C-alpha cells in the first residue's frame, strides 16, 4: 500500500532538503510551492520512493 | 464539491456548448482538449458553480 500525502505534510516530517532531494527539485521550489498553496500530492511507495503530481487550473 | 467527473464525461453528460460556457472557454478548447486526452476533471459545487483542473507531473 502506497501512501499519498500533500507536499506540505511530507516537508513537515522530512524537512525541505530531503523533500527537495526526493522530488529532484531545488529546496527553494519546495518552499515556494508550499507558500503559494500549490496543490501537489506525493505518492510514497513502500520503499520510500516518491512520485509527485500537481493539480492546476484549467484553463490556465 | 458535490460532483467531480472527467472532462470527456462532462461533455457527454451536458454537451459541448454548456461545458464551454461553464468554464468560460470557447467550444474548440473543449473539443481539442478531449481529443488530446488531457487529464482534466470538472468539479460541480453544490451552489452550481463549475471549475476545472488538470493533473500534471511535478516537477514539469
Ligand atoms: Cl534553493
Ligand atoms: Li497530507
Using CA coordinates, name the residue in chain A closest to B23. Answer: A59
Residues on chain B touching A51 (C-beta within 8 angstroms): 57
In CATH terms, the fold of domain B1-60 is CRO Repressor (3.30.240)
Rounded to whole angstroms, the Cα distance separating A25 from A42 reads: 13
Resolution (A): 1.4
Quick one: which H or E segment has residue A35? helix A27-36
Contact B54 A55 (CB under 8 A): yes
Residue B37 · residue B55 · CB < 8 Å: no
Q: Strands B3-6 and B40-44: what pairing?
A: antiparallel
Q: At CA A56, angle to CA A55 and CA A58, rounded to 5?
A: 125
Grid cell in block for residue B12: 457527454
Contact A56 B54 (CB under 8 A): yes
Rounded to whole angstroms, the Cα distance separating B11 from B5 reads: 10
Q: How far does residue A45's CA lie from ligand 2's centre (Å)?
A: 15
Amino acid at each position: 500500500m502506497e501512501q499519498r500525502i500533500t507536499l506540505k505534510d511530507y516537508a513537515m516530517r522530512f524537512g525541505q532538503t530531503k523533500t527537495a532531494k526526493d522530488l529532484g527539485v531545488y529546496p527553494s521550489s519546495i518552499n515556494q510551492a508550499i507558500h503559494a498553496g500549490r496543490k501537489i500530492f506525493l505518492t510514497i511507495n513502500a520503499d520510500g520512493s516518491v512520485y509527485a503530481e500537481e493539480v492546476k487550473p484549467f484553463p490556465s
